[PDB]
Amino acid sequence: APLSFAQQRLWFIAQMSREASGAYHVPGGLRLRGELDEVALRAALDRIMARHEVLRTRFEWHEGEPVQCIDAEARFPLVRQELEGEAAELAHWQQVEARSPFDLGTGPLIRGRLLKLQEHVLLLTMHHIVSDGWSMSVLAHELGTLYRAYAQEVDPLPALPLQYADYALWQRRWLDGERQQRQLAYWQQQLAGAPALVSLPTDRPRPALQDYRGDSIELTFDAGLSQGLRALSQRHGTTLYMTVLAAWAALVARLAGQPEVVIGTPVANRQRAELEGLIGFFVNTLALRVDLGGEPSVAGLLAQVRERVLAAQSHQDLPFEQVVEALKPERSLSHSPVFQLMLSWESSLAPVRERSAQFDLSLHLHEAADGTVAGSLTYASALYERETVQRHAGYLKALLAGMVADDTQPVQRIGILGEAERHRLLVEWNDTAREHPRTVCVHELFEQQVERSPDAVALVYEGQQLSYRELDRQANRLARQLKALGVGPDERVAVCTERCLEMVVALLAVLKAGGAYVPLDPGYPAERLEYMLADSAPKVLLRQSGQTLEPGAGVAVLALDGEASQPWQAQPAQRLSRDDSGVQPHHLAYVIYTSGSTGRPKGVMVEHAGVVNRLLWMQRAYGLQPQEAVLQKTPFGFDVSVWEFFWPLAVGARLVMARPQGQQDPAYLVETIVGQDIGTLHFVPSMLQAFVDSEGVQRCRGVRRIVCSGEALPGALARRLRQQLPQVELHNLYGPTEATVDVTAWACDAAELPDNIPIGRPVDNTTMYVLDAHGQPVPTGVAGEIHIGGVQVARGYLGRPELTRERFVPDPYAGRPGARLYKTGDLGRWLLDGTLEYLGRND
């Protein structure tokens, strides 16, 4: 049972308060090994309390603003504990200790949980309004020294030079001065026009409200990589933090497809030596804008990062909140402002696993004792899966290694893919090899079905019917007349007719005569039909009676129906032998013209073998049975009609030829579906929308399969079809004409359909590749240009050899000499489940 919209948002609002309870505290712990001497702790504990004025400072409202109340020096509030277990005891105790809220009014802001587990567990906690990250590190310096003094006080040994109230009084004057304005002018200039949101590929769409659920992984740079990065940093004058910042910004810009990347970094902001050792809120955030346009080298990028990091650390006094309200006074609610990725360098007991994510990714790294670099990468679980973050950390380590190998190469072309993912992308997700007969042509699939069911119904048109044997005999007669007119292998036969029984007779007869058919839709303007008729240079024009299209140019014209078609009824109805025609699977099956994009239409030459594979895959995936009917509704100038014609005829089903221009009657489609028991039909998504919006669509409960292709299928439309026809199996198919109708398919059978309906997995004997501008495979989730391989790649464009070599390129992956890929010009990406997602056009 789903929650309402008001209930769903109110839940996320209530959990932001739970996120605030844990993220506004500074937890920590220390393992104590030594003689049981509590007699020295309380003396050492209260000594650090009274030493720093912030440890006992209270806050409250007075005269419309929060006031600072310096309190009389008090004692430490420690709770006695006696541990009872191990795993569940320590993990839960240490968790609720950090999540236990304080009170800014009364009650102290330093909290401690001590326990005897000889050996004691000393948990400490401070509030962020009186401390930060460093403030606990100096809390460990004093606590360790004061216990030593109380074992062998505070201020007399080494007094503190200042207290936080003096820093706040100084900041109040600095914020009003002209140095604040100039630092505000630099940050307004540095981050002007910066990308508001990084487009890192996410495994799930970004929620409307930011989800603070977080998880983390562990990553380390081994002794070799940490050593090489130190030498690389020495050679370019950068520190080890700047070298990692350059690599991470280089990785993110490559993964997100953006030129610039903004990465945040927390700084202590204790620039003045007086503030060192003091306890309080000093940490500030700097937004680092790294540009990567122009394809810089490793040295050029490190020099850019060297300039921007130094300039950022010189203007680190301005609060980051004032940077936002100046640049972005109008911000979003689904992501953090200015930046969404943070890199913290923690150069130096241990804390627990970070389960909160204030940003998309937060990379924490530190320099270990053995010279190695270790840390964690915390990610928002609502955006990324764990395996995606692990591959992300692998890319960074791979990119850092390449920078050490050569600091002069282009940084954005360094290989980052691991061998496991590369093999999965290229081979494992393309394991579509299926054993189909590579010796059969398209018309022979029909002829084999004629022998199995000669008296079964094959064609239906406005009451007229043709059985499999009757259709085959009619096609054989016309095929012999075509053979007498020079039709043979690779020769074209133009066909100009409206939908009728004779349309299918013509197509089968051309294929039987060994030629390739060229569909000429009479609805197109005469100028277009005359160009395609001249460009294809056919041997014969099969013309329906009433059509006035005249080719000239020595082209033979045969009447397809009417009284003028009677002469070729005298031909014998027997089948032409395999040698009488001479056609083979590598010969052309049809030439279908696409309008290109802007200009003259181009004839796509498609061979028999690819069409047979496309048809044989469709039956294996969907199992069309002889008793079913398919509706021939798509104009035969579109290659969708190819499987509408030849899929049912190859398996024993019947094909219902829709009325010409019949859908002009708004009720014709529904009445024909019900009246003819239509089980399978095709829609382009724009036409499917009109179908689910049409009157009486719910009467079509007998429909079995709806194939969608040609456009992007919106998930809302797919979900609308379920509500109207709960029984129909919806399938999303993708593929251009140059790859034989379709090459990927995705069943819309999931219990919950996404808004972006995937185009799916490659079909039988077909391969798919997502490549960058240099023909290299991109990481999972990264957008790139779709390339198609396998048997369904067309021969090329009829009469345009230069465009053919431009879009039909050698296949370097198939391991087969002579194989070719088709560059689609479409943008796509792999999902982590091995399915493809259409994203749009490359241009």
Ligand X SMILES: Nc1ncnc2c1ncn2[C@@H]1O[C@H](COP(=O)(O)O)[C@@H](O)[C@H]1O
**Which residues form the interface with ligand X (CB under 6 A)?**
709-712, 732-737, 759, 824, 826, 838
Q: Could you give the strand order of the β-sheet that contains 260-267, starting from the edge strand earlier in sequence? A: 214-221, 373-380, 361-367, 341-345, 260-267, 284-291
396-434: burial string, b at 16+ Cβ within 10 Å, e else: bbbbbbbbbeebeeebbebebbbeebeebbbeebbebee
Query: How near is the Cβ of 839 to ligand X at its closest, in Å?
Result: 9
Question: In sequence order, what DSSP letters do the residues of 136-200 get, joined into one string?
Answer: HHHHHHHHHHHHHHHH---SSSS--S--HHHHHHHHHHHHTSHHHHHHHHHHHHHTTT--SS---
Give dist(CA 108, CA 798) in Å, integer. Answer: 84
Q: Is residue 269 a known part of a binding site?
A: no
What lies within 8 Å, CB to CB, of 307 at 6+ separation is none
Residue 732 binds which entry of Mg ion, ligand X, Cl ion, none, CB below 5-8 Å type-dependent: ligand X
**Does residue number 760 form part of the binding site for Mg ion (CB under 5 A)?**
no
Q: How far separated are the first and last CA of the chain, in Å rounded?
A: 43
Q: Please state the three-class secondary structure of 633-699 as a single string.
A: CCCCCCCHHHHHHHHHHHHCCEEEECCCCHHHCCCHHHHHHHHCCCCEEEECHHHHHHHHCCCCHHH
Cα angle for residues 171, 174, 180 (degrees, 5° grid): 120
Query: How near is the Cβ of 531 to Cl ion at its closest, in Å?
Result: 16
Query: How near is the Cβ of 330 to Mg ion at its closest, in Å?
Result: 43
Site for Mg ion in 711-740 (CB under 5 A): 735
Query: How near is the Cβ of 773 to Cl ion at its closest, in Å?
Result: 24
Chain breaks in the chain (C to N over 2.5 A) after: 117, 152, 348
Query: How near is the Cβ of 260 to Mg ion at its closest, in Å?
Result: 37
Do 791 and 589 contact (CB within 8 A), yes or no?
no
Do 613 and 792 contact (CB within 8 A), yes or no?
yes
User: In terms of DSSP bridges, do strands 65-69 and 58-62 run parallel, antiparallel, or are they unpaired?
Assistant: antiparallel
Q: Which is nearer to Mg ion, 375 or 735 (CB)?
A: 735
What lies within 8 Å, CB to CB, of 163 at 6+ separation is 52, 53, 54, 278
Query: How near is the Cβ of 821 to Cl ion at its closest, in Å?
Result: 19
- The token pair at 758 is 């995937």
Query: How near is the Cβ of 177 to ligand X at its closest, in Å?
Result: 58
Query: How near is the Cβ of 637 to ligand X at its closest, in Å?
Result: 11
Rg (CA), the chain: 37
Q: Which is nearer to Cl ion, 141 or 805 (CB)?
A: 805
Residue 826 binds which entry of Cl ion, Mg ion, ligand X, none, CB below 5-8 Å type-dependent: ligand X
Q: Which is nearer to ligand X, 542 or 707 (CB)?
A: 707
Strands (E) located in 472-550 = 492-496, 516-519, 540-543
750-779: burial string, b at 16+ Cβ within 10 Å, e else: eeebeeebbbbbbbbbbbbbbebeeeebbb
Q: Which residue is nearest to ligand X (CB)?
A: 736
Give dist(CA 666, CA 680) in Å, integer. Answer: 20
Residue 802 binds which entry of ligand X, Mg ion, Cl ion, none, CB below 5-8 Å type-dependent: Cl ion
Site for Mg ion in 213-242 (CB under 5 A): none
Q: Which residue is nearest to Cl ion (CB)?
A: 802
Cα angle for residues 74, 79, 82 (degrees, 5° grid): 155
What lies within 8 Å, CB to CB, of 103 at 6+ separation is none
Do 591 and 518 contact (CB within 8 A), yes or no?
yes
Residue 838 binds which entry of ligand X, Mg ion, Cl ion, none, CB below 5-8 Å type-dependent: ligand X
Do 306 and 242 contact (CB within 8 A), yes or no?
yes
Do 655 and 467 contact (CB within 8 A), yes or no?
no
Count how many residues are written for the chain.
843
Q: Is residue 710 a known part of a binding site?
A: yes
Q: Is residue 554 a known part of a binding site?
A: no
Query: How near is the Cβ of 609 to ligand X at its closest, in Å?
Result: 19
Q: Which is nearer to Mg ion, 514 or 735 (CB)?
A: 735
Residue 712 binds which entry of Mg ion, Cl ion, ligand X, none, CB below 5-8 Å type-dependent: ligand X
Q: Which is nearer to Mg ion, 365 or 591 (CB)?
A: 591
Residue 800 binds which entry of Cl ion, ligand X, Mg ion, none, CB below 5-8 Å type-dependent: Cl ion
Q: Please state the three-class secondary structure of 90-115 as a single string.
A: HHHHHHHHHHCCCCCCCCCCEEEEEE
Contact set with Cl ion (CB under 5 A)? 800, 802
Query: How near is the Cβ of 733 to Mg ion at its closest, in Å?
Result: 7
Q: Please state the three-class secondary structure of 21-45 as a single string.
A: HHHCEEEEEEEEECCCCHHHHHHHH
Strands (E) located in 361-462 = 361-367, 373-380, 457-461
Give dist(CA 66, CA 44) in Å, integer. Answer: 31
Q: Is residue 596 a known part of a binding site?
A: no
Report in angstroms the alpha-carbon separations of 306 from 30, 187, 229, 309: 37, 17, 15, 5
Query: How near is the Cβ of 646 to Cl ion at its closest, in Å?
Result: 31
Q: Which is nearer to ligand X, 212 or 638 (CB)?
A: 638
Q: Which residue is nearest to Mg ion (CB)?
A: 735
- The token pair at 188 is 């307004």
Query: How near is the Cβ of 532 to Cl ion at its closest, in Å?
Result: 17
Q: Is residue 214 a known part of a binding site?
A: no
CA dihedral 348, 349, 352, 356 (to 10 degrees): -40
Cα angle for residues 389, 391, 397 (degrees, 5° grid): 105
Query: How near is the Cβ of 735 to Mg ion at its closest, in Å?
Result: 4
Q: Which is nearer to ligand X, 338 or 794 (CB)?
A: 794
Q: Is residue 826 a known part of a binding site?
A: yes
Query: How near is the Cβ of 827 to Mg ion at its closest, in Å?
Result: 16
Q: Which is nearer to ligand X, 561 or 742 (CB)?
A: 742
Q: Which is nearer to ligand X, 610 or 736 (CB)?
A: 736
- Where does residue 610 rank: exposed (0-12), middle (13-18), buried (19+ CB within 10 A)? buried
Q: Which residues are annotated as a binding site?
A: 710, 732-733, 735, 737, 741-742, 826
Judged by the rule CB under 5 A, the positions of this chain that interact with Mg ion are 735
* Residues annotated in a binding site for AMP: 710, 732-733, 737, 826
Residue ranges of the annotated binding site for Mg(2+) are 735, 741-742
